[PDB]
Amino acid sequence: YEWLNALPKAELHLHLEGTLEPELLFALAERNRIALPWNDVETLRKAYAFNNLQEFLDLYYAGADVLRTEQDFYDLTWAYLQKCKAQNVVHVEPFFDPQTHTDRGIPFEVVLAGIRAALRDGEKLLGIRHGLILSFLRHLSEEQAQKTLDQALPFRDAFIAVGLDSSEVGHPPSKFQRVFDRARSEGFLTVAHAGEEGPPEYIWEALDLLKVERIDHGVRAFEDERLMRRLIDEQIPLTVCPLSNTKLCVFDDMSQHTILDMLERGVKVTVNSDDPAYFGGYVTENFHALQQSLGMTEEQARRLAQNSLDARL
Ligand SMILES: Nc1ncnc2[nH]cnc12
Numbered sequence: 001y002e003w004l005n006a007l008p009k010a011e012l013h014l015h016l017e018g019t020l021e022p023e024l025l026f027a028l029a030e031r032n033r034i035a036l037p038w039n040d041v042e043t044l045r046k047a048y049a050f051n052n053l054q055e056f057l058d059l060y061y062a063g064a065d066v067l068r069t070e071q072d073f074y075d076l077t078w079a080y081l082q083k084c085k086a087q088n089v090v091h092v093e094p095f096f097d098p099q100t101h102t103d104r105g106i107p108f109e110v111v112l113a114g115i116r117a118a119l120r121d122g123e124k125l126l127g128i129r130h131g132l133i134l135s136f137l138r139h140l141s142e143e144q145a146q147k148t149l150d151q152a153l154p155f156r157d158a159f160i161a162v163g164l165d166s167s168e169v170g171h172p173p174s175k176f177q178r179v180f181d182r183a184r185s186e187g188f189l190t191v192a193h194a195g196e197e198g199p200p201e202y203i204w205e206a207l208d209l210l211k212v213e214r215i216d217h218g219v220r221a222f223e224d225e226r227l228m229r230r231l232i233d234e235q236i237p238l239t240v241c242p243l244s245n246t247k248l249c250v251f252d253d254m255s256q257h258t259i260l261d262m263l264e265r266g267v268k269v270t271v272n273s274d275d276p277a278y279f280g281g282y283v284t285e286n287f288h289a290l291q292q293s294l295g296m297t298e299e300q301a302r303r304l305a306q307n308s309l310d311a312r313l
């Protein structure tokens with residue numbers, strides 16, 4: 001563990017909103033004078049039991065209510081940056097979901113100010129490089145994403161890419177091909193969630209329609225050998241999230257996770273925490289789970305950490 005924790009790493013698949021610890025949630029609620037549905041932290045924490053992606057999302061979006069001020073968004077991000085320092089994550093390319101906040105009335109500029117301020121501290125005080133990624137909510141319309149991209153244009157230099165998260169199944173990457181096209185035209189790189197719950201086909205779409213630089217999750221690629229051969233051949237990175245897949249029931253157990261299989265086959269996989277406050281672990285805890293449940297070796301530990309460095313944008 002401490003050896004794992006000592007490894008230099010880059011986290012490339014993380015949602016800032018998904019780092020919202022129960023304690024922070026209650027503290028922001030207090031500061032913002034919000035009456036929570038949850039009686040206590042302990043009760044909110046017991047609600048972290050999931051049977052699929054959707055059950056998690058509903059709760060995950062519910063939590064975002066307490067994010068109201070610039071200081072809120074600073075606290076959220078700074079708390080995570082501190083975890084990174086402690087776990088020797090030296091480089092972060094985090095997601096945020098503008099629509100979750102803008103749709104609640106919070107100004108786009110306020111969200112960004114808070115996050116940007118923290119990232120600046122992360123780098124000058126903690127030594128942590130960052131590449132903010134703006135993620136679209138895929139259950140909403142492409143039109144809504146276009147409106148979000150328009151807000152992002154004056155800010156475009158604050159983002160290294162646009163991503164795509166939220167309810168995967170029944171919202172294929174194709175639904176968002178136009179806005180992605182425009183984003184790239186405007187100088188954005190692209191990434192996308194694909195093959196978490198969605199089929200291999202969605203991953204082909206991300207690759208070929210959205211033209212992503214990396215696949216987020218991408219575990220269901222395992223079902224598709226032609227795709228596997230392509231991943232291995234193009235060295236397209238996968239941002240795999242062990243505890244997230246476990247907690248969302250992608251795998252019925254951690255002993256059944258295929259990330260080490262992929263590693264050995266030559267897929268350029270990485271280790272990430274995804275939504276650490278909800279899945280009960282940060283990046284080091286994800287490496288640890290691999291060692292515990294899949295007898296991962298230091299050997300494979302070093303390779304995974306290195307892929308994450310190599311896969312930076
Ligand atoms: N892993 C994930 N998949 C889909 N939507 C998400 N929103 C936050 N994390 C997510």
Ligand SMILES: [Zn+2]
Binds near residue numbers: 013165193274275
């Ligand atoms: Zn994710």
